[PDB]
Design a protein around this ligand. Structure first.
Ligand code: HEM
Ligand code: HEM
Lengths: 362, 362
């Protein structure tokens, strides 16, 4: 129920312990006025400080002028902060506006086409994003709703994704959650306590070439549909061979315990863990922070199921891209399809009460 | 921790309201009564395991490597989470298996109501399973595994996830707010009110359909809210729509949420005034709905609302009169009914040898 501090050198919602729920929204910008956009970032920052402490935005949800709409939509009244974090990112397309073209980071790379991609353009891209994570879904929806309302006339929602449950871990001392394939997902991640690994693999450094991004990170989002009919008729051995870990304990093949270190040569050559492991990718390491989704039925008699994959890294070119390229032969590809994609530059943190989202850029 | 599965009544109606919902409607594909009965028995066996926090069948792992696991595994390590599984039978089921003369008269087809915009794909269904739990993954796991067990005999027609409160951080007594920011549930039938349940919720033998004794009738309505239009309404307009204030949820002219309403102080077309039993010849409902937020539609608007569930002793004397009286509701400007289904919810599974539907199939 507690609040996660909002201010810091880094934005919260990355290294932070992974909360139970996600509401992710991508927005397109509809104003050409730089000053108006800056004003929105400041207003959004002010709102975020209230929301993340469990307070209503503006002058509140009620008790104002009867003839005016309330400043806060009211559906989070009486709720705790619920570990809400709000993380903003800027997409490549943003840099075509406001005279920003020369400030686009080289590390904000467009992704290549990957074999098997079937990307829906409507649910891909975006000028900016807000990742809202919280333990209470109502708290997360309220946050995104109120930001969108404040932004009316300057930004529009392009696409959104709700995640009903986490499939990631930044806290190895707590139970690793399972994805909808039934396997633990998050065992070998980066922990929020691993400051050296965060500095090496997640946070942008000044020397990386883009000073305004120092202390920020880069985010890849992939919406991945799972072929659960196909998966559910596979044998136990086939499922375990796909990953290289057993299903019950999630230990590497041959070993007893989840957190025993993988011995890669015992896995099949196309096993997901073997292909994705840093040692298979010149050391490339990611912070994975995704969530599961189900968006109804597929109209063919089955549940829709997927995983909204989020990865944070210091450079897209040295993080997601090499690892995904190495998954071209993954045995898991038989059971998944990537159907949405976006990348974002996640700026540094809001340092104090006078700072604002995007201040280093603008 | 858990809710007993066996009883004179199915759990999930009068038992404590859990934080999360996964509701699925199924269509039956077999014409073979014996095959359907066999399914109902297998589903009951699975429900007994699921509601106790155990995997279905021989488990999620540790069986023959060359066989698919009996349970898909995504709830391993989770708690029972107060899971309840409540089955119901739609009118269309009664056109199969020689059942036409056993359709209860209380299982009435709904009339067309003014402003209905029903999506046929998200309406109807031969059967439903209401899965309620505090952990959405427990609920989803239940539905996914029942659907898998039934594959070849049933298909999933439509599915809806929902949420109420988050009990870890929100006190049990506190009325949840809906997504319009109003407290929702103040004047309802509570599960403690045994005589009101007998009067208004449970079917009795003398009502005309003996197999339904101890069951109930369910109306489901997927009700979209026009969030962005609502949020532009003044505070006074919002309060006028309901007849209660937004902050406290007290009836107009009263001080406290639970103060009894004085209906004449409310506007004639205020929702509470139109819906109140006194305005409907005493008609009283058990509401057990959940909020939903599915994402954003093509115009960038929030696809959100109330998945309305009402239980009643007879649809003709519960939902139908009350919804008819809402023809002129001030709330209609801000909502649209977009899915509908009705179900007969059979009596409880009495003991370990009983099975869902046994009073109907014999
Ligand atoms: C639906 C899609 C996916 C599923 C179901 C999945 C599942 C898994 C599982 C079960 C593990 C082992 C436990 C763990 O260490 O977390 C794992 C590990 C991992 N996955 Fe995936 N994964 C998916 C997609 C991806 C993608 C798209 C990437 C990157 C492009 C990726 C990168 C990794 C990495 C880096 C590891 C850790 C390997 C190691 O260092 O041991 N995964 N995944
Ligand atoms: C999105 C749609 C709806 C919303 C947002 C909504 C909201 C509310 C709110 C805020 C209250 C007052 C607090 C309470 O006593 O629960 C209420 C009461 C009530 N609603 Fe609705 N409602 C909706 C749809 C319906 C429908 C479809 C029906 C029935 C056909 C219904 C029947 C009732 C009843 C019976 C009451 C209690 C009235 C009383 O006895 O005081 N509502 N609703």
């Amino acid at each position: 129920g507690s609040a996660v501090p909002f201010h810091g050198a880094h934005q919260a919602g990355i290294a932070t312990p992974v909360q139970d729920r996600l509401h992710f929204a991508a927005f397109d910008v509809t104003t050409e006025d730089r000053a108006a956009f800056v004003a929105l970032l400041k207003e959004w920052t002010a709102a975020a400080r209230r929301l993340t402490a469990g307070h209503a935005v503006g002058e509140g949800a009620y008790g104002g002028l009867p003839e005016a709409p309330p400043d806060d939509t009211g559906e989070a009244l009486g709720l705790k902060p619920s570990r809400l974090t709000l993380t903003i990112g800027f997409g490549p397309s943003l840099f075509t506006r406001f005279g920003l073209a020369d400030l686009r980071p080289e590390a904000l790379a467009d992704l290549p086409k990957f074999p098997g991609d079937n990307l829906d353009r409507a649910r891909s891209g975006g000028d900016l994003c807000v990742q809202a994570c919280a333990d209470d879904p109502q708290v997360a929806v309220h946050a995104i709703r109120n930001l969108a309302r404040i932004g009316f006339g300057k930004v529009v929602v392009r696409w959104s994704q709700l995640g009903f449950g986490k499939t990631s871990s930044t806290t190895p001392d707590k139970q690793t959650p399972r994805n909808l394939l039934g396997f633990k997902d998050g065992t070998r991640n980066i922990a929020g306590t691993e400051k050296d690994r965060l500095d090496r693999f997640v946070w942008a450094a000044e020397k990386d070439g883009t000073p305004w991004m120092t202390g920020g990170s880069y985010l890849v989002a992939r919406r991945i549909r799972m072929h659960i009919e196909t998966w559910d008729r596979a044998s136990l051995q086939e499922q375990e061979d796909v990953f290289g870990r057993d299903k019950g304990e999630g230990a590497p093949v041959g070993k007893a315990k989840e957190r025993d270190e993988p011995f890669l040569k015992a896995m099949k050559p196309d096993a997901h863990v073997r292909l994705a492991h840093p040692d298979s990718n010149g050391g490339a390491t990611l912070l994975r922070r995704g969530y599961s989704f189900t968006d109804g039925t597929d109209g063919l008699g089955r549940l829709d199921a997927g995983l909204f994959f989020l990865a944070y890294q210091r450079d897209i070119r040295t993080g997601f891209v090499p690892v995904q390229r190495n998954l071209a032969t993954d045995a898991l590809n038989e059971f998944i399809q990537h159907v949405g994609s976006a990348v974002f530059a996640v700026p540094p943190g809001v340092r104090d009460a006078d700072d604002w989202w995007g201040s280093t850029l603008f």
